[PDB]
Amino acid sequence: VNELWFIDAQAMFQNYANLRSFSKNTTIGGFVFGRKARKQVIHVLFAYAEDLTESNRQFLESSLSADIELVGNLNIDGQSQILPGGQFTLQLTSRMLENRSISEFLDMNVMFNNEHVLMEGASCVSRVGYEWSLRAGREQEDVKSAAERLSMASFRFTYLNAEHGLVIREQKPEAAQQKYLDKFSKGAVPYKDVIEFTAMQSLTRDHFTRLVTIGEVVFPAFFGDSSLDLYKRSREAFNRRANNTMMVTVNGIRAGRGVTTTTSATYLPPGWVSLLHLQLPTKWTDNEQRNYRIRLHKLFNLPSSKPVLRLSQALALHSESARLTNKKLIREPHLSITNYQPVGEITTVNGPYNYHHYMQDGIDDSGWGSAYRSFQTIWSWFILNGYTDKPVPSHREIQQALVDIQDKQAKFVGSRQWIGSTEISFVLNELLKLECRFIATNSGAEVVERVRELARHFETSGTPVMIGGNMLAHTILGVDFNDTTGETKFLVLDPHYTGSEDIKTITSKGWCAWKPASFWSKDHFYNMVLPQPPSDA
Template sequence: MLPLDSEDLLFRIKGGFQLEGMLSKTDESDIKAGLSEAFKDLISKVNSHAFILNGLGGSLYLWPKSHASTSPSELHDDARCKSILKFVTIEVNDSLKRIPKKKSLKITPLKVVNLQMLLEVTRPDVIENVIVHCETKSRLHFRLNLPIDVVVFAKPEDPWGKLQDQFVEAVSSQLSEMEKCIQKYTKGQSVPVPQAFHFELPEKTTLTTVVYPAGISDETLEPQRKELHTELGLGDKPFFRRSMVYQFPNDEINHKYRRTIHKYIPLPNPEDFKIGIAHGSYSYHHYLQDGVNDIEWGSAYRGLQTIISWYKYQGYIDKPIPTHEDFQKMMVNVGEEFVNVVGVTDPIGPFEIESVLTHAGISSNIMNIRPNNQVHMEANELVAHFHQQGTPIIMYVEPMSYVILGVAVNEETKEMKFLVLNVLYTGDDDWSNVIEKGVEWKSLEFWDQREPYDICLPQRPEGV
């Protein structure tokens, strides 16, 4: 995962390149051959003085191949990478700076430098010869827009000259990956548009970019993802579905709900505890969101919204996160016992929770914990659930529901901790308030062992 406390700069290079060329025939093999030639030509342009980068919203222009710029005195080869910061607008989530330090990990918000790609059509210092070639054969001109999206990480003190070479290498590399994508997925005269997606992986401190063809479903792309999992030594949990794409700072800021908030608070010491944590991403739902006053009755609904958001962001569900009324209508479709539930402001319990998940296509197991049960044994089962399934779980104790995102167990001392997402929170979604009051590791005292508990364990579908 990307470190939360790093001064590294992330340079994001975006833009549209026109891939164009001529075809003498339109069968699949000739189309692929023509596309291959066009890619070679485009890569050669990127590796020439025609390749330009522009700082978005500013007057800075860079010629990476020649290491030239419109500010040569500041951006010379031996300058530090951070020198560019005075010329460009930085994309950063400054709200993360307000997260309380006493509770959170040390956070240095990621700084993203956005650069736009251009290709210089003519150069004023170069006189080119024009050659007119007469061709009597019928030929077809093709043009395909390639949406380039490249990321390059650099330390602030890295030399600027070296970084410019990395820009050229990174864009050239992505064009090569786009050619592979097109060659693989072109069928007949149907040529897909390749698209780049950036993902976080557990053991990597940079992003991993994967190129997928537009218009082809995630289900169809499963073999490609399996190849990536094998190549990178990943398990059977998903990492490369399109919906799991990395959220850049502006994505976080503009998202309606806060996502995956537990990553900002420290884990228990892994040398002392066996730890299981929810895999992937979810959105945080709690009382009073969306203009609905559901205090005292809506905790299960908010838990269900959080659970279904997990399935949505892992790419298993492609629908909006349901509202309270949506859930009640699902219950009506389940059976006659729910026929009058729409509009009712009563809490719902484990049967209703399981019924709604089943209606949404999500299977689940129910764990019953009765007074005097050995909670330690159950906690180990929950750790195993997070390792194997990775889904958040809902714990119900009448009349409230809670979302559990993780469990930590010390086998020697029997000490236990539970990572609780507080769906009862009634405040705003400011980052500092959400981290302060929305998520916390709680001790065994969180459980009232005189009360019965029902825990809903949603199951993850097979496949990556």
């Protein structure tokens, strides 16, 4: 036998736990989504009985990338409701989920192998609009049918890239151009490598409330797929988004919230290897949005602790997508590291952040902005992880804050005066009501022999660490630590003068690299501020 299905069991176990993290006893079932072609599972979504509904499996599937579909369901013990579908039914028990044992899984599900499922392919993205006319008095009926016809008319669309001369369109099987986007989708990752298209429509076909919905459409381009493969996914991608827009719109109507416009967004929630596509009701009450934002956490098996589906942390794949940061700034430079061999255990940032440094925002902080820049990187983390909408403060905004709390006396505001680890914590507390912890040392040698404190921080709080000492400020993004040979290294984002958004120059030079323990001076004392993330999502 070799019809073996592949599955990341550890990822499934986490999704069960993420659902269970909303309790505090109705039964629990779930759907299994995956790439039916290669017999692999990408998403195992659990849900209570109440929510195992054909109405709900369509919400889930409309939110997943175009290539993955319902490949089966699951059954914990034998007491869960199941919605008939797919080729198989996963047999689980309530105990093999609590402890998370892969052994018991592979024994109860024989036609399955465990595999650490990885991210694949690039992401084709294009902006699309469509008008819906709703006869007042039965708008729920019309929006439902409007989405039907739109899925029927979607086959005559055409996405074409001007720069490279590419065209995604309806094709006969013998017109398929094999290996079409290979030089774009080779060693590519959905969250970074994009191929932007322009959506066009043939001219051969087209009291009340009108509704013009415009958003984006993201479909994966893998390696070695043909122009026909791209097309078939590009259509399914559109249909799913169109339905997604309709379901929430209907949901809004029935909740008495009327017909509101939506905002398209694309996510990669923590742990996933495929994107999450959502049509967000951006015209509801903040509270109404929060409860809907909460529901989706339950429906997609997402953490209840940290925010995930906040607009601030939405991926900006389309060039016209509104950003809450600076498009010029480099996002997560350390991730673009070239070939590092760990000397021991590794522990880095848990989240996205932007590289702020010298001579960036039209200010020349040759020597005195080192701490300000490190502060800015931390602030980016809190934006990019859905803790704040407020933008990165300038040098003057920061200095104003220290003055506001009576700590530097207004001579500072117009000043090129230095600050440090402490002053950073003061501003963060004033602007974002954040709490900060410290690692106060008396020598850089102490910084090294207290590595375990940093690794514990990055493992639990994730936030970047600013380190002041020896008149220099830096940003620590990770530690490499072997508790046997005692050799420790630090991942240091140097806030000291890039001047040119340029990644290859960063990695090659000393900026953002793995520095040894010899870095910190043995003669000067260092302080480390550890930003602490707040408790709601």
